Design a protein around this ligand. Sequence first.
Ligand code: HEA
Ligand code: HEA
Ligand SMILES: [Cu+2]
Ligand SMILES: [Cu+2]
Ligand SMILES: [Cu+2]
Ligand SMILES: [Mg+2]
Ligand SMILES: [Zn+2]
Lengths: 261, 514, 56, 98, 84, 84, 43, 47, 75, 227
Amino acid sequence: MTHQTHAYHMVNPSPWPLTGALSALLMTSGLTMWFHFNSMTLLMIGLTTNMLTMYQWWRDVIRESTFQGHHTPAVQKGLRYGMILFIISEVLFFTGFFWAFYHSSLAPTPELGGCWPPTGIHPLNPLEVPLLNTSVLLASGVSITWAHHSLMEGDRKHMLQALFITITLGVYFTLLQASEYYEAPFTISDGVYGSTFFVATGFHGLHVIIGSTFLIVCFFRQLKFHFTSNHHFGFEAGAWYWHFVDVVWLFLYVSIYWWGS
Amino acid sequence: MFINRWLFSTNHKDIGTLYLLFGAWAGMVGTALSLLIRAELGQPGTLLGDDQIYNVVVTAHAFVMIFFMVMPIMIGGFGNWLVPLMIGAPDMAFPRMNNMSFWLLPPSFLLLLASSMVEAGAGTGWTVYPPLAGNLAHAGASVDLTIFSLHLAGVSSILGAINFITTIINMKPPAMSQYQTPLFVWSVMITAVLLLLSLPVLAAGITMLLTDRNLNTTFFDPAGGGDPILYQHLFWFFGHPEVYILILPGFGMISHIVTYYSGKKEPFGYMGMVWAMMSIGFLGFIVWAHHMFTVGMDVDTRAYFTSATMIIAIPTGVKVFSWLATLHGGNIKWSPAMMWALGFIFLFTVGGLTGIVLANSSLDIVLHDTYYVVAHFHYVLSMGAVFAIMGGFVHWFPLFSGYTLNDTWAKIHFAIMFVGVNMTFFPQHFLGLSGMPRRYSDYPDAYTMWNTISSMGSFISLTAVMLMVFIIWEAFASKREVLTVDLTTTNLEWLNGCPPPYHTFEEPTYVNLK
Amino acid sequence: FENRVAEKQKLFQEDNGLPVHLKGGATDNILYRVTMTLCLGGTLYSLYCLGWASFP
Amino acid sequence: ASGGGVPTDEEQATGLEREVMLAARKGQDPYNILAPKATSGTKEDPNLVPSITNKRIVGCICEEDNSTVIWFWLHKGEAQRCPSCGTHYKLVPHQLAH
Amino acid sequence: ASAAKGDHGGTGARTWRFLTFGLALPSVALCTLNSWLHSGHRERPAFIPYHHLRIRTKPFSWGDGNHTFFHNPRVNPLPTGYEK
Amino acid sequence: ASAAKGDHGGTGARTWRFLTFGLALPSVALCTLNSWLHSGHRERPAFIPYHHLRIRTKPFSWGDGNHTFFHNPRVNPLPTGYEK
Amino acid sequence: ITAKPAKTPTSPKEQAIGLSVTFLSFLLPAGWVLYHLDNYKKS
Amino acid sequence: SHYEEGPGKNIPFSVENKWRLLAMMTLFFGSGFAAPFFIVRHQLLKK
Amino acid sequence: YQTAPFDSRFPNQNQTRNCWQNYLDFHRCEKAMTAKGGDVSVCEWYRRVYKSLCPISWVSTWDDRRAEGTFPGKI
Amino acid sequence: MAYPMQLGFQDATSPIMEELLHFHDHTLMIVFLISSLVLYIISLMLTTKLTHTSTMDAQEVETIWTILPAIILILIALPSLRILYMMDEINNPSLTVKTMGHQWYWSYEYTDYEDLSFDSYMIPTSELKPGELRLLEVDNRVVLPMEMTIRMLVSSEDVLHSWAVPSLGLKTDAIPGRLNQTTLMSSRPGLYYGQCSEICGSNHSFMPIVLELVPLKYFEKWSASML
Ligand code: HEA
Ligand code: HEA
Ligand SMILES: [Cu+2]
Ligand SMILES: [Cu+2]
Ligand SMILES: [Cu+2]
Ligand SMILES: [Mg+2]
Ligand SMILES: [Zn+2]
């Protein structure tokens, strides 16, 4: 009593949960304005307060762990579980989209021409840029691993070098994918093929951007000596998320880009 | 101060209280909606109007009771309040995130309220199936708002599911195995896993529905080659686990209540009980299609789903029989909570037995979309999930508040509600066997008797939920402070007195490693 | 490069009875108020829009 | 490869993290991260329950495979016994607390 | 289609840095060249007003409400036909 | 078709013994019953001297050199036709 | 479960008041809206 | 923590005056039960 | 001819393809007997079946699609 | 149709519906057995002053109560599945009618030979002739030949709808872009009512189904006078 004798973390009252909850309200209702009464001001404010919340909520977490030392071993083991579990819910999110795809491509309705890809659709070639995007993502898988190993071996320069290479490959994929979208001879509106394609590869795209800003954050935390050769969960997570991202692309490639086209 | 405590919390007890408050209020809205439903059906004719205004009411009834009363109360309320106390944890693994879970709820509720105001609301059914939910048959912001409300409520529940699993797994005393935690904790740890795996598929489904009606996609539109049935699969893949997610924490509370008032140390067959919930949770993931028997699927697959659905009776059976075995040599105390526990055991049995009937695709052909299925789920929800909530509420109220309830009044409240719900839902078995469809604002003259009796019962229930509010007031008005609690040796939640201090287990708990 | 986590550890461990989200200075405070302001205002604005859209 | 540059816990760990780090190397466990090992539990060899106050909740897993932990407050004073199996427990002042 | 190859039993950072520059990056270069060589610009596909394509049940929330987001006029026709 | 289920974070022998008798074995029992119920004895398939079947380029190293190893006369015809 | 006597007991009259009030607060608003249904259905 | 403890103090509403409480509970649960009625009314008065 | 008989390749509750297949089949046969003459022989069977099973609106729209050349099936 | 104060199923107009009544009786007999067993055990447990609060051995009795429910489930499953296949059985229909759900009316199409098609709408309770059923009468009944195997094909031209006729033990959803099939086979003449069994908008409750079954002879003359 008074002084605690358990290794856990009693976090100080934060206004951030309220702030982020309000943010969700603003973005959701804001999308409703954009979609219906053609307005984005509300959507803009929501995106704003949301970034503000994430910045601060994560800034504090850094403060509490790196500056204040609350991340004892027990606290860390809990963060590992949390991340795993989160990645899991994500894996099941993408599963709705592969279900959708397979459902459509395995039993093509007559309005499509009773075939797959539907008549009128000119699928991209898996052997062209899709093949490139694949090799880029896969390489960042090996380079992020090199980064992880340098970090554990206390090799500051190399961890930085590998983390940098990894980050640029992630960006390279983003640009490449962006151009593919623009050059694609089909759109979201091109029936079920376009729907199925643009939302699955699209949500994944959003995830590569989310994973890249995460690695960027890790980059700077390292420039500032935040990570020790032994305590760098922020990186472990960034790394786990990054792999989830290659893997999802492997399924996308094989399913949508290769098999279903 | 108030702000810091109530808006900026990181306390499992306070967040849990905030939930119970949200759930009770939402419970009022849902009750009002259920009364308009029976008001409309209590006399042949139309009171409100067309199946649109009526079905808007039926839809909000479902969303409110499922997502805003039952889930917040059982998982967020009792979950946050009791879990840490039962495993000897100082709090939860992610105190801050835990708060966001709660605060995501009021906005979510707003979006749902907003949906029924703009345009003509959402008269789609809680399943919000397309084409009816589409931008043609349901143009306007309504359905979109219904969808966004569901997104938030889902984000809220999987964030909390993440918290409970981490806490429950990672924050028990070092010498305590998982096979040493109480059934309630197991009950929410398992419910937490179902939420983690089912909720995302729903979000995948309704996001596809959202794009279909705002971004010109055709996931469920035949024109583009879509399939309205695809939505049914996605929805129901979540839709079934969802009902177990709704009864599991109830199973747990019941195990605690029956054992306590039987004067027993522990429940009969503890490991059988753990096995049972785990089986129930698992089989619950491979039976979704029993909700699609009249959709045009292959006879073979239709056969698979009726069988798979039926084996769930076995584990559920070991639980019913275990609670009975628990009462066995007990020194029974006829307390209000024990009354709720007994009702649950019977009523839930009847309602689940009635669900085995519907498990049969052949018979379900003529039973689907009728009031028989409305009877089935109200038995397991109105006198199953809800009875557990009441038993748990009256049993733990002193722990949460420090004050006691007037037991006699509390017993009167059971009597009234027991009569009310049975009178309301019993007749409905007939209306359904005899053909009265679901989601109708009016019915052929023949169905008049049962619909009348049914509606009268709903008024008795109204009386009971009014009395309860009073019962809570009186408790707080009189202020009889708790002194002594029985069987604390085997019930940790009570060891820190009523109410436990803001900070419990500041200095851990000592548990030997034999 | 630098490495001055040691200065910040000290700054944040300082017993000034401040909550972590403010323990870092004046900017923490302005950021806080800006965020809080935008959220509340936005929330007010949203309620207005809904009241407005509720009507034909 | 080759080189160096990243901090170590021994040199950069702070707060409670550091406290358990050091405490752990001295073989002691002030923040109860480990499971306390039982004594014979006889009146003469009671289990010694350290505490930072004058009472601590003791949970007794009477028999190895038991699913029910017996809970109770252990107070400062004479050795006390688990209500279900005797087994003596005696409170003791908690040393290291930083 | 491979099976595997040169085992180097001990993997540390030197090994991963070796794979990065000795395998990973060289592949990204080859494929880049490949994709830079197979850069055949396909002539915009023949327009035929199929009903299962160019779907429009609600005008898009932007522009003239008839233009998809990453609209490329060269290869994407409007429902009516190619842009210009 | 599942997703997963009841997590019990700590796995020791008790957990695996629990899965063995509480999951593994019960499944073997169900499927056993299933296969014991679907035990429909198919009537021996119609014989038609297809050339791509009952291949014989070298008599088998046993018996009359025309009988496959696990020969079941009820359902396996010789090249000429069913045994008897 | 034992408890100390009420610090501020609620006499029957007091209960009768709280019970009546609790009822009215539920029954009135609904009753009013329901009482005027036809007026709404006829504009 | 300057957070007060004990019966009647671990809640976000005052329980010190039974009648002020009566009022609050009445508005709280009351407004919740009335909402659906007024929404239906609102929908019935549109065109 | 009474009505389209049971078709083994379409043994389940869903007949969508049954309607679809025969509609194609007929028009595919028709086009051939035309571009071959072969005494302008005619594949009536398929038309009897597809007319029985396919709801009017589908046949209509398909015919129109075939008219403007936006019919997705390959004939 | 359904009469006042009815408890169970509408009388079976067809053989599978008869088959169902018997299966339900079987299934219901069991739910009565179990539900009364549980109630007896419960009252038994709560009726003695004798106590035994010490530990009790589980598992032993745990087999009885796990193997028993398992046997009972087979006793229901078997009959259920048989009827299930019996419904999706290889039959050869002598007629094919199509029905298309629409937002607030069904339309039928008899097109085996001639292109006969009409709309079936509910008769406003206001224009009902004495003796006519309030929310069940339709203006154009779907006429069909009694004692014959008909093949119904259900679909919709808009939202989802569900075509059902309880007396015949039929219910098939109407999904746009889909052709669901069902076998109708009444073994007796008459008027057989049903209703839309799927939420489809404002008048979901007001789009009934009325089957009128007469002998072939009268069926064909009706068919012709219909165009
Ligand atoms: C908490 C709520 C809850 C619970 C626990 C259940 C439990 C079950 N339900 Fe469900 N059900 C609902 C709520 C619930 N249900 C809802 C909301 C709907 C409608 C949704 C909608 O479409 O809108 C519905 C719909 C529904 C349908 C589809 C109806 C239709 O055609 O539309 C089916 C069919 O399989 C079904 C079956 C079952 C079964 C087999 C169980 C089993 O879990 C029952 C298990 C219990 C027992 C079996 C009794 C105890 C055990 C014994 C005493 C052992 C001995 C007994 C035997 C051997 C039989 N339910
Ligand atoms: C939690 C689930 C839940 C509960 C408890 C209830 C309770 C009630 N529901 Fe139900 N209902 C549904 C969920 C629920 N319902 C769903 C999912 C549907 C399907 C919708 C669709 O078809 O799309 C449905 C459909 C439905 C219908 C069918 C309409 C139709 O299809 O045409 C009817 C009609 O009678 C109805 C009536 C009622 C009634 C009379 C009550 C009464 O029993 C209510 C009694 C009041 C209570 C039991 C609440 C009191 C409890 C509290 C307020 C908690 C208090 C808090 C604390 C103690 C802290 N409901
Ligand atoms: Cu289900
Ligand atoms: Cu309809
Ligand atoms: Cu309908
Ligand atoms: Mg249905
Ligand atoms: Zn002991």
